[PDB]
RNA sequence: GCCGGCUAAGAUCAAGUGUAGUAUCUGUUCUUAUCAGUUUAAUAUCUGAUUCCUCGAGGA
């Protein structure tokens, strides 16, 4: 018996969403990553409804969803990832309503393991360097630049991944023109398993670590 | 660091193995889609909920010898 | 005569086996062989 | 021993499995064994079939006794004269009461068997009372038409 | 005649192969069917490592791919495809 | 007795400024090697092949038969650079060592002839280990550095192990890897 | 210019041949006969020494026009041709000759080389077999999605040969394996695949260096085509084992079938019961909803 | 300083497939455990083997390779394709887990040739024509091991049989 | 392999040949024995201790 497989009706679970000039214009635009399958929605005010464009059914698991529109940028470039470390950096373009993936970088395996990054995804608005990391001591830091054209050009990796550190959330906060600083909620959980009273469950709590990816030091630096 | 972080080698003891097992077993929980809004219906809790629980849960499973 | 092909095939061995008539049997090679065989299959059924 | 029943009279054209096949209508004959020959390397005739139980082999002896099989005398059992190339469905007595027409018989004769199965070697030994009854088998009885085997009386001993 | 890798922080670096070594993948080590490209980390082109070939370690005539029956096993995604060990190191003939 | 299963091939129609090489190459095509005693056979011409060029036969030998069969099956009438040539059965014809402490630069100062004499030694004792393809010894060296390069590094390895430890010239010499 | 263009191909210019490769691949693309068979005969038996050349141009001119070559010439022909030219050209050359046959294979049907090969192994010969292995290697490692039409009839083949026979008659039915397990991803052919893995698993206890990569390759192929929901199944029994050499082998199978599928395998897991002494169920897998 | 043969088998809910040398390990619990397995496959034989199992039969006598008829039975364009994609046959080998062990190789109704050379004749339109076997089930009476067994002239009617079939099962 | 055995079932020392690598060949010994420790899944291995009879001799 060979069957075939065939979606008579898409998703209907918002899991993500990220709001911004998408399209360029001042139109705001809001993508939802809803699982298998991901849409962007235009919240039209003249009929109060939001209506969704495109509903592209994207193949994988987009573990985060953080949208980044550059300095002096009309659109946004959308980074996602996937059940593999391939991080996908895509801008809308409204020529025929499809996506256009502007870079598709390598950065592990497949499958979203506590060692492979694609889980979590800390955009830096005051400046660049995109954050992708893990949960378990896996986060790369992808530089983002503008060439003549204005153009997405992404850096090589940064790897800055701690040791047998687990990874609560990460997000990049804006700093006034400096080297920007990306915290996390990370904890130690090696120094707690290495001991056989038991007490090692109490007095290790979680922590914000805060790394300055300065271009000068060229890697990032707690 | 990454080396081979994930699994022992010929005399890994059965605990640290099933530690591993869970400390990977989550992220495919705290990440997967299907299996994260499963447990949510269950538990009857909120995603931040659940997530929360899992990712604190992280520290030392299975019956950690802490 | 082959002391050497008695110590490497398992040789200067014994097992008692007290279900099977409390026979002695030889090495690891007659050990599990000793646990299958119609002296050990008897006394086991004479056993109950 | 008892649930498996030894076929004597068996052919070329007799198999392993063509015994277990021809005795399944009788009963459920779960294995077929044949001894092979150490210079011909084929059966001797003789084989055994091993049923799951006793009556089956019970019906199998007294079903398939005698029979023409593969143009050989088949037959089911429960596992100075000298005869050869006799059918191995007579008994002693049976062939006493086939030896008492020609003569009078000393005592019950035997037969000899396999050291395997136990059921029929092929030859047979009998001794009458005198030598005129041995002169009357080795004159009618060597030659004569047994149940489907040309059988062969001879002299055991004789001084020249 | 077990080859060692770097396999560091795969960069932006597109691979390449000498005139002789382009074929085979940098890893497979095989021709047959080239699936994806290979890359680099920051340490495999820098200076004088400007367009060298990943596997004959001189000049690159190509760029250096993966064999089909090694991009598909995900032997792709490690780190850096760059065939040096501590024979094949920076300080060698 | 034996009429099938031949491994001898005769090529006719040969031209006479043909050479050994040549037949070698052409032999090569669809076999490997006969060169059980030294060699593979070759044509025989009138002096024993040394005046006469060729008596417009050469004959072939492979390790199997079916190689011979498919080479007389397509190499039929095969052009060479002066004829086509025909093929038959019969026809009814016919790495480096690094070794210190083994000399001194004042032993040679007032003897001309040690020099040579312990490079002699040096290469006589290496050529025991090894085919050595080259050997230098650098007579201003204060340790007495010598440099032993062979073809395979195995022999290099096996002359490291005999000669580290062991004396030469009443002195304690050692020999090490490169 | 057939025989014009004939010694042009013998020459080692490298542009040169580059071009007269392409020529003569083009001489036999419309019309294609054109010549008598031991003229095509004898330019295959001199193209397939440049199959290797150090010029990826040339090998790749050189296989573009040997297809359409077998395909003008015939079958049953270059199949021969190949065949009797495995025992010549020692192995320095020879394993190019081999590549020729999968060019067959890839120049003409399955049962091109298939039923023809498979005579080749009747022999008794060690190093005959041991030939048609390796091409048989090569064969299912450029046939591509090719294999999934006919693979049980070639699954005994390599299974006789993936028998205690000799040491290297083990490496070339474990890369065959691999290289077809790979080309018949997902194409619905496992139960072939699982045939030959139940021969391919006891061959891992291997002492040899040069010959556990063969089996450590064909696992790391099978990992990947297969989905450890069964090669997990298969090394679990052991990854506990008494034996400190027995374990070194099954616990580096499981790091080779980890890397890969590493959270394909969670879902694949048996229930580790709970002690005492800690919570080894995942009890957060356990629910009904 | 470990447990015994017999308090780490007893211990176990499952000792049907307890081994000897198992009991030696780090954890015999968990490998225990582990070796429970639904439908898993252990260790292959040559664990402890020390023959590399070839080296013990190593006189091997069998063809190497038997030509399957799948395929076997220009080189052919109407009957090449009709014979191995058309007239295969499948494979028909271990299932999930026969891991190869050393050897693993090596450990009513009557047929015409037995019929023909039994001198029997063939079956009548409307006759009877019993085996000599038949003779003593229609004396004796039917066979206990068989009851559902039927034969010409005793259960079923003459006009059945057909050709080499001298009987039918009828299970009820 | 032959009809349980005929010591071709294993480990190990010295030397030669040779490879990029694996290797290939010749000549040994094999504890015939016990205990303690190391170790091995278990062996193995290694580390230490341990007058009488006969016909001037031999054996235990």
Known sequence: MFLYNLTLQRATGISFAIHGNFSGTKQQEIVVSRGKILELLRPDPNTGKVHTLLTVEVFGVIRSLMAFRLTGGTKDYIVVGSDSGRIVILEYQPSKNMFEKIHQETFGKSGCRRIVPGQFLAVDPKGRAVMISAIEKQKLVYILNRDAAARLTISSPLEAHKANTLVYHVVGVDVGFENPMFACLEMDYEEADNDPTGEAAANTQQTLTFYELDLGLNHVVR | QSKYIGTGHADTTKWEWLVNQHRDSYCSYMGHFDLLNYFAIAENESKARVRFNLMEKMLQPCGPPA | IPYWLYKLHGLNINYNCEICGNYTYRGPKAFQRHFAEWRHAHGMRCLG | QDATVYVGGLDEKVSEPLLWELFLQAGPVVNTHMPKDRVTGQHQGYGFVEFLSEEDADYAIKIMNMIKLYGKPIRVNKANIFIGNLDPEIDEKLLYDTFSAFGVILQTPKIMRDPDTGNSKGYAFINFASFDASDAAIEAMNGQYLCNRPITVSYAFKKD | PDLIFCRKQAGVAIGRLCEKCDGKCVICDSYVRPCTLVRICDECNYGSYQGRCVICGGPGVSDAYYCKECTIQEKDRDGCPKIVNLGSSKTDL | ?178 | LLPRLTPILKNRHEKVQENCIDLVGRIADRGAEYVSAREWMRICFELLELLKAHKKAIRRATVNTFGYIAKAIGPHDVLATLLNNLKVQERQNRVCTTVAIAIVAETCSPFTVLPALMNEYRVPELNVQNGVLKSLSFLFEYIGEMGKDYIYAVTPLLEDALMDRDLVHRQTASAVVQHMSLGVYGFGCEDSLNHLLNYVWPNVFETSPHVIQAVMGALEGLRVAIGPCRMLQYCLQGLFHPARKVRDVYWKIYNSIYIGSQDALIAHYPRIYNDDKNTYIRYELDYIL | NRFTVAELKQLVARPDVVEMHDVTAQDPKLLVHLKATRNSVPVPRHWCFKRKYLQGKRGIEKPPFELPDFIKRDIDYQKLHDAFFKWQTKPKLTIHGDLYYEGKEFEGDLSDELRISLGMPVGPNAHKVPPPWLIAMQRYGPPPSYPNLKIPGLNSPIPPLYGDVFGTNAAE
Request: charged share 30%.
């Open chain 6, 1 to 178: 007795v034996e009429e099938d299963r031949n491994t001898n091939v005769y090529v006719s129609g040969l031209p006479p400024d043909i050479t050994v090489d040549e037949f070698i190459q052409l032999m090569s095509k669809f076999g490997i090697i006969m060169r059980d005693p030294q060699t593979e056979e070759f044509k025989v011409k009138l002096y024993k092949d040394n005046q006469g060029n060729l008596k417009g036969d050469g004959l072939c030998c492979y390790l199997k038969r079916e190689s011979v069969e498919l080479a007389l099956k397509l190499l039929d009438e095969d052009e060479i650079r002066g004829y086509k040539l025909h093929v038959e059965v019969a026809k009814f014809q016919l790495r480096v060592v690094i070794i210190k402490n083994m000399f001194h630069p004042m032993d040679f100062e007032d003897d001309p002839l040690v020099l040579n004499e312990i490079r002699e030694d040096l290469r006589v004792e290496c050529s025991k280990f090894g085919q050595i393809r080259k050997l230098l010894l650098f007579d201003r060296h204060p340790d007495g550095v010598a440099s032993v390069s062979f073809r395979d590094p195995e022999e290099a390895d096996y002359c490291i192990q005999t000669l580290d430890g062991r004396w030469f010239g009443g002195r304690q010499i050692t020999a090490q890897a490169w």
